[PDB]
Structure formats: structure tokens, C-alpha cells
Design a binder for this molecule. Structure first.
Ligand SMILES: CC(=O)N[C@H]1[C@H](O[C@H]2[C@@H](O)[C@@H](CO)O[C@@H](O[C@H]3[C@H](O)[C@@H](O)[C@H](O)O[C@@H]3CO)[C@@H]2O)O[C@H](CO)[C@@H](O)[C@@H]1O[C@@H]1O[C@H](CO)[C@H](O)[C@H](O)[C@H]1O
Ligand SMILES: [Cl-]
Length: 138
């Protein structure tokens, strides 16, 4: 088991064909999960499943630049379940991050941060038991 929050270095940043795989289990009564792809203090891609926002479940995605959050992108398709094992795959493509959960396509997030090779950390945080976090080039 990994300790959360967990930092995964992404050496030399991200690049198309880089596949990041996160395995874990959502805690019972979870409130949130966050994946934060970081460029220094900025968050190039924030992926934030929320389990109770006004008693609804929603994934919020955004970018943090100079400590300001941008315009949120919201997805109501919500494949996570409290208590249950999940797999998140983030595949870097030329124009977006492409996210699949449990082998099903979920969403894409267009690159707002252009310096992919400076997005050199992934923070994994929130209400999970984290089993593994890794990357490979496909
Ligand atoms: C309060 C909180 O949860 N802080 C988190 C931070 O959460 C923000 C993001 O999810 C953004 C993405 O757009 O939304 C913010 O809420 C919006 C909300 O969606 C809007 O409807 C509303 O109108 O505005 C608010 C705020 O603009 C969330 O507050 O996400 C970051 C990245 O994961 C977290 O780091 C932060 O938690 C803090 O992290 C610190 C270390 O990084 C410390 O752990 C600190 O104690 C945490 O509170
Ligand atoms: Cl940039």
C-alpha cells in the first residue's frame, strides 16, 4: 500500500504516448479524490471526483495558474463507487489528457498548460487506499 498523499515524479514532464496507471480502492463514505498533474506550483490538470456536492456525484477538472483556478470542466458520468476498487488510466495525447476508468473511456481534458515537459509531478490525494501508481510509454 502507498501513503496518501502520494507524489509520483514524472521525469522530464509528460509527452504524448505516456500512460499513467493508478490502482486503488475508494474508502467507504469517501468525499473526494484528486489527481494533480503539477508544473511547479501550478496544476496543469486537476482531476477531482466529488462524491457529495449538493448530494450529487460529479467529476471536476480544472487548471491552477499562479494560484488561480480557471473555468471548471464538469462530467456527470461518475464511474467510481465508495468502497470499491478502481483503475484510472491517464494517456497523454497531443491535444489532451485522455482518462479511462476501469477500462472505459471517461473524459478528455485539452492542454491549457503548453509546456508538457515541465509537468513533472503527479500528486494523488483524497479518500482512497492507494495500491499502485506508475507510468509506461506506449
Ligand atoms: C477546499 C479544497 O477542497 N481545496 C483543495 C482544492 O479544491 C479546489 C479545486 O477542486 C477547484 C477546481 O476548480 O474547485 C474548488 O472549489 C470551487 C468550486 O468547484 C466552485 O463551485 C466554487 O464556486 O469555487 C470553489 C473554489 O474556487 C476547490 O476548492 O484542490 C486542491 C488540488 O487538489 C487541493 O490542494 C486543495 O486542498 C488543499 O491542499 C493543500 C495542500 O495542497 C492542503 O492539503 C490544504 O489543507 C487543502 O485544503
Ligand atoms: Cl505553459
Amino acid at each position: 500500500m502507498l501513503i496518501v498523499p502520494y507524489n509520483l515524479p514524472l521525469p522530464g514532464g509528460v509527452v504524448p504516448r505516456m500512460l499513467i496507471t493508478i490502482l486503488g480502492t475508494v474508502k467507504p463514505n469517501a468525499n473526494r479524490i484528486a489527481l494533480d498533474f503539477q508544473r511547479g506550483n501550478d496544476v496543469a490538470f486537476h482531476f477531482n471526483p466529488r462524491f457529495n456536492e449538493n448530494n450529487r456525484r460529479v467529476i471536476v477538472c480544472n487548471t491552477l495558474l499562479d494560484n488561480n483556478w480557471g473555468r471548471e470542466e464538469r462530467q456527470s458520468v461518475f464511474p467510481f463507487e465508495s468502497g470499491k476498487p478502481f483503475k484510472i488510466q491517464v494517456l497523454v495525447e497531443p491535444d489532451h489528457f485522455k482518462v479511462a476508468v476501469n477500462d472505459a473511456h471517461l473524459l478528455q481534458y485539452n492542454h491549457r498548460v503548453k509546456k508538457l515537459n515541465e509537468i513533472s509531478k503527479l500528486g494523488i490525494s483524497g479518500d482512497i487506499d492507494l495500491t499502485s501508481a506508475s507510468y509506461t510509454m506506449i
